[PDB]
Amino acid sequence: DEDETTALVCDNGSGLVKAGFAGDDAPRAVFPSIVGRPRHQGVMVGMGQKDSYVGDEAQSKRGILTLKYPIEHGIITNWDDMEKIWHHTFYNELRVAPEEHPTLLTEAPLNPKANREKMTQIMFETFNVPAMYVAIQAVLSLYASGRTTGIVLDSGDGVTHNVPIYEGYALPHAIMRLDLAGRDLTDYLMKILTERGYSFVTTAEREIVRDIKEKLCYVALDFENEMATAASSSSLEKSYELPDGQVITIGNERFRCPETLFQPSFIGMESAGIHETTYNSIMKCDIDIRKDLYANNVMSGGTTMYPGIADRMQKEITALAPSTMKIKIIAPPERKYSVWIGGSILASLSTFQQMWITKQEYDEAGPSIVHRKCF
Amino acid sequence: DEDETTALVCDNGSGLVKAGFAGDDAPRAVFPSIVGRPRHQGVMVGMGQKDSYVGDEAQSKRGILTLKYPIEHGIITNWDDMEKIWHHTFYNELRVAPEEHPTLLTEAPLNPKANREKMTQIMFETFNVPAMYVAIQAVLSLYASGRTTGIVLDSGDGVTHNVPIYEGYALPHAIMRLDLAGRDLTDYLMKILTERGYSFVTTAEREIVRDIKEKLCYVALDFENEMATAASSSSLEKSYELPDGQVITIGNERFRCPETLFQPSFIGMESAGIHETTYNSIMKCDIDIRKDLYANNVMSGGTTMYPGIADRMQKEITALAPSTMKIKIIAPPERKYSVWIGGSILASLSTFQQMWITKQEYDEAGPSIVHRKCF
Amino acid sequence: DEDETTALVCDNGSGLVKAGFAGDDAPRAVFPSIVGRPRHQGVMVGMGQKDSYVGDEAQSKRGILTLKYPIEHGIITNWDDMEKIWHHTFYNELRVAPEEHPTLLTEAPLNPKANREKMTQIMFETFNVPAMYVAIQAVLSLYASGRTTGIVLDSGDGVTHNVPIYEGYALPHAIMRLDLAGRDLTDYLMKILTERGYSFVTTAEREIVRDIKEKLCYVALDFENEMATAASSSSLEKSYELPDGQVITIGNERFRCPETLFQPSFIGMESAGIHETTYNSIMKCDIDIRKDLYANNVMSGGTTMYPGIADRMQKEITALAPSTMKIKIIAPPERKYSVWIGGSILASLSTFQQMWITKQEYDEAGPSIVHRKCF
Amino acid sequence: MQALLGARAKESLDLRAHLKQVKKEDTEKENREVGDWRKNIDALSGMEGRKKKFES
Lengths: 375, 375, 375, 56
Hints:
This is part of a larger assembly, with 3 copies of chain A (375 residues) and 1 copy of chain D (56 residues).
Chain A: E1 8-12, E2 16-21, E3 29-32, E4 35-38, E5 53-54, H1 56-60, E6 65-68, E7 71-72, E8 75-76, H2 79-93, E9 103-107, H3 114-125, E10 131-136, H4 137-145, E11 150-153, E12 163-166, E13 169-170, H5 182-195, H6 203-216, H7 223-230, E14 238-241, E15 247-250, H8 253-256, H9 274-283, H10 287-294, E16 297-299, H11 309-318, E17 329-330, H12 338-347, E18 357-358, H13 361-365, H14 370-373
Parallel strand pairs in A: 1-9, 9-10, 11-16, 16-17
Antiparallel strand pairs in A: 1-2, 2-3, 4-5, 4-6, 7-8, 10-18, 11-12, 12-13, 14-15
Chain D: H1 4-29
PDB class: contractile protein
Keywords: actin, tropomyosin, troponin, TF, contractile protein
Entry title: Structure of cardiac native thin filament at pCa=5.8 having upper troponin in Ca2+ bound state and lower troponin in Ca2+ free state
């Protein structure tokens, strides 16, 4: 199935796991970060039926399953479900045995330390991986984009990291991590759709609202003007097909939900939005750094695909920035996946083959070693 | 005497009782659920003549008997008469004493507990069966049909069950058990035929009407067009031969009686009818489980032989159902006998041999054990 | 009956409508949200009779009526029936009507907005109300309870809202709406009473099982210990008198129905129960809010009349809550009536006299005005 | 691109033909209850003489 003894890459978020091998430009498969379990009483004998479902299995049989996500707000807490997702990911779909391949995993630098320690431990103790390396999603985004400098807004499912990097160096005092992500936008949409008469509360219903957002939503370049017409006419409405033949029609809610990115107060968060975080990450850096960060704002991850987002962000930051200065956004088509690609790039660089924790150093030190060896 | 000690299988309804051995595709014999008793003074001596008759004996000698049915709306109200029926069914006719074989009986999943408990008690205490298992009728319908997913609507003589099952699991919150059944259709026909000039009130008369229904009645997929002609012309009437050579003809009443399954008000019942209960069994399930239940309406039990019932049950559901969605009725030849056949299938599964109540566990726990071990 | 143009207050649910005039601390009368219709053909003449019956008329003549409820989960689906109920409520029994009085309505914060738009149109165009306001049920519960802060569990008939309020302000990001209410608890009870041999299907039967729940059921502080005894001994059983002189004897079903509040899985709902739901409304608020919401768990609406609810809720929240913290519960005798009572308080507060929509603003803007002027 | 849909088709055919198989099993292992009987007759071929009993 694979023709090289290369590194493996797995970007594990609170939404989905993107997994494949180092040297490619795409994951072999994307496995949702889900372990599903039946919530109903069985009645038929000898008709199979599993006790639990993993990844794509969990979504395929979801009609009667409650679906749980092992990762919350950027970190892994249900380490047991992570090991099952990984076993499936590696052995059934990537068709690899990590014992024979070094593995690269990712996190955000302002996430809690336990995440990198448990991810490292699972790969060394249950998979016997010869080596490990936990990467920075912002680093991977800059490699994928062809940059050494910029502000990376990685749009996670859990959290948004917001980090300035200059000439390959971290500028950590200027990181503005924000507790606003794709799962919060999804929760907001469940509540706004309730206002319109469509109640979405169960797992199947929650998965649908996420799917509605992905297909119907946008941010808009100008929220107030967009709402002035969206709130006044059916001409800005779009219908979504619910998987039972019924439809839901959504109007200004189509953008009011993504608007939370610019207005986090919509979900109860105290924040001025993603353009404030971008701005402060530049502003808190020295003036001989700022010129290069203004010219290199980097969009990575999901939400970066919303209509109006690259143009809106450039407008929102140039509005806060000084005049004369050029404010620019980098937003490649390798959207929602460029961080995976960055994983592939880093994992396969010759400059990175000395960065690995080996299964010698790990066995001698234990998982706390990841804090000294990765970043 | 048998090649193997397989379970005896018997489906005890409010209408018919059917039995045979596990592993075959048909019951050996069918009996009415009847115990008969003379309603006349004997005058000749040495005429044989029993104090009570069972099953086919009761029906064959019915000219001077009053006939009683021990089962009503799916449950046994007279266990003494069922004891007589089981002895006749299993030992006199299949020629197997339950003492040497496990016995598989059946009941609806929302069938009152006293009935599943009494069936367990009698087979263990009066027949000394070595093991028991009371099957879910919907499960057996699915086993006989070759389905794991669908709505089992068993429209029998006793009760219509309406249960949604997905991937071998029940969705109990969506079961619409309804007290509308084939026995009511028979009594309605006795009354409507009275209106036509052919009164029916006695046991013999009821058995004639049940025979008329079974040979002459139908549902009509489009009853409005069917009655517009049937109620206007003799060309739509069908003749029936009565036991004494009389002939009765029936016109729109021929389908108006079965129509009660869709129009329950004809017998004074407050109900939406079987097509709406099928609809709600589907509609009350999660949206990722309805797309499969709409495509799998599973017909079972008796009354399913009326021409037009499958098409009449698919058209009405389609009318209630969302557009785009495919609505499909499954109405196999294993109709009316599907529960018995499914019983045979369940009994022979290797995985089902771990489901039996033994005649050890039974005495330690008592008959309430049926709720710990069966369902 | 009245000598002043006081505001009228109506609390309209899927159960009953509580109604009376502002300034009172109780409704003047209760009007079941019912329209009854005969399900039988009339034979006698000179019998009076109605084409349709409402409220208490509908219940008094119910022996031959089918009884329908115009409201589902807080939404009016049949407003023509509500206008008949309201006409009776106002002109026949309360002896007050919107025509000569301003009117306050009670609603949930996420009640579909279209529902307020229609009720607004009806009171202004059918009943000619000079002014309107639609108030939050949680607000009304807090005024009636003597609080400005707390989690209000408004326990409706078809839905429970669960909204945290602090210092008079909504904390909407922490609303944990649950599709579980008093009408669903009734469904569980009738299914388990069906298992005991007492099916409840038709209208008269539906009303009886609701009445059984209200008079016999309770939650208790400890379900498992209550069941260990109730499932073992007749000393925990109670016989309820049915309308025809027969009785139903109920054991642990007496508490299993109410228990669905703590165990929603009993009716097929994917939920951890009202104490977890209350816990999350507190726990998702900022930590300097949390202490005041833990000290103010407010029970309102219906089902809170179940014995042991104050203790069951306080103990479960305390178990979920951080240690040191004091968890307190409010469960006043103004239960089930506190939403109506709060409506009276709010309608009459001097601070609220300018909060009314006049029938000037209404016609200039139309019914959608409620979305801008009320909430 | 050719293996995944193949596997899905294998699973679907397995479930359907397997419910067909479990029911056809019951059909084939027991084909005795779907049989019949000879139902012979005595017919009293002796319309040349009568019987000994007092009733005859």
